[PDB]
Amino acid sequence: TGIDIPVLLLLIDGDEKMLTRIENATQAQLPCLLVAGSGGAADCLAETLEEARDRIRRFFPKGDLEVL
Amino acid sequence: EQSWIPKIFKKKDAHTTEKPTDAYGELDFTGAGRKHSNFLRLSDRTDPAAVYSLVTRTWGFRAPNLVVSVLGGSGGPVLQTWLQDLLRRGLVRAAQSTGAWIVTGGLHTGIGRHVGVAVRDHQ
Amino acid sequence: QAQVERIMTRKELLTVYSSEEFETIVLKALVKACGSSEASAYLDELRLAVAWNRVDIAQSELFRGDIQWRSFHLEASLMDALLNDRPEFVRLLISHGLSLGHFLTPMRLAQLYSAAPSNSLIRNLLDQASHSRPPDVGHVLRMLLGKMCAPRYPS
Numbered sequence: 001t002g003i004d005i006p007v008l009l010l011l012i013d014g015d016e017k018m019l020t021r022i023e024n025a026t027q028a029q030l031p032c033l034l035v036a037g038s039g040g041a042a043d044c045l046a047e048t049l050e051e052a053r054d055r056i057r058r059f060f061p062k063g064d065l066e067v068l
Numbered sequence: 069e070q071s072w073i074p075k076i077f078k079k080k081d082a083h084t085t086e087k088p089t090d091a092y093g094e095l096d097f098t099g100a101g102r103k104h105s106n107f108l109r110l111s112d113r114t115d116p117a118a119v120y121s122l123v124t125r126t127w128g129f130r131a132p133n134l135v136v137s138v139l140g141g142s143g144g145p146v147l148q149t150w151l152q153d154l155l156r157r158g159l160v161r162a163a164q165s166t167g168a169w170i171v172t173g174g175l176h177t178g179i180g181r182h183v184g185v186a187v188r189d190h191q
Numbered sequence: 192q193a194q195v196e197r198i199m200t201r202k203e204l205l206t207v208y209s210s211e212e213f214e215t216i217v218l219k220a221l222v223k224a225c226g227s228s229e230a231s232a233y234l235d236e237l238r239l240a241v242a243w244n245r246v247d248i249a250q251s252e253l254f255r256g257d258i259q260w261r262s263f264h265l266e267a268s269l270m271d272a273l274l275n276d277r278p279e280f281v282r283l284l285i286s287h288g289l290s291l292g293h294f295l296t297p298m299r300l301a302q303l304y305s306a307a308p309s310n311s312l313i314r315n316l317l318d319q320a321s322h323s324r325p326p327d328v329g330h331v332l333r334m335l336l337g338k339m340c341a342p343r344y345p346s
């Protein structure tokens with residue numbers, strides 16, 4: 001400002017591109033929040049935090065399993 | 069004060085070259101009765117320092133206590149009402165106490181549309 | 192021993208019922224063996240939960256982000272919960288994307304008043320208003336509250 005300005009990212013849901021967005025926002029450190037129960041990339045990342053291929057197919061039926 | 073905008077920022081990728089920015093200035097929505105806003109056209113190459121200085125010093129917005137960037141999908145249709153309550157009675161209600169910038173899509177897509185209406189309601 | 196091991200290979204299809212209730216165990220067993228996620232395979236479980244008032248089972252198992260619900264899936268369950276006085280399911284189904292503005296129609300609105308008990312006061316008032324077929328709720332409101340305060344129902 002001389003106080004630091006905190007920045008946070010909120011992920012409601014997403015397609016396969018939101019995984020890339022989260023990876024890019026994590027390599028360059030930025031905290032992220034994942035909405036539980038909203039499906040998509042948010043739920044895919046939330047369920048592994050707290051059958052992996054089965055989960056990836058469950059939230060990404062058309063996704064490339066190995067790359068995902 | 070907006071005169072030097074075409075010189076600091078550029079519009080349009082090896083097939084293209086940079087050119088002075090043309091679309092910029094204030095923005096009024098016809099008949100909306102809202103406050104006068106600001107808008108700018110800029111290329112993806114632009115480094116964040118110039119844009120941040122523009123927002124903080126030329127447009128007059130004060131430095132934010134915190135920034136929350138909302139990213140999501142579902143495209144057109146509005147979200148389920150529990151997500152609506154999470155947006156309004158959650159993020160926006162909390163940001164009302166500290167004061168904050170909420171960054172998301174500036175379009176009429178569902179997530180941006182509900183973020184805007186929640187911000188307006190708490191305004 | 193071989194038979195018991197062959198059975199125990201597939202524990203997902205087995206549940207234990209202890210006297211220390213029946214509906215909850217039935218719901219758990221039915222959900223445990225579903226597997227798919229197209230939201231068509233869970234309608235039966237949703238109807239059973241509505242009938243047995245299993246709010247927590249529905250909210251935990253049936254409404255998760257994996258299962259992609261939308262309005263036409265939940266309209267029938269919402270009407271079932273409205274008619275049979277299940278407030279928690281009414282709250283749950285609306286919160287999960289059931290557009291109330293499109294849902295409510297004069298037909299279903301009249302059907303809701305048909306759920307009143309035959310001996311209830313509101314039934315007698317409706318019959319008296321009709322004796323003075325639309326529900327005629329506005330006439331009852333005029334008789335009760337008077338012209339000054341009665342809403343011009345429908346709103």
Ligand SMILES: [Ca+2]
Pocket residue numbers: 221225232233234235236
């Ligand atoms: Ca089933």
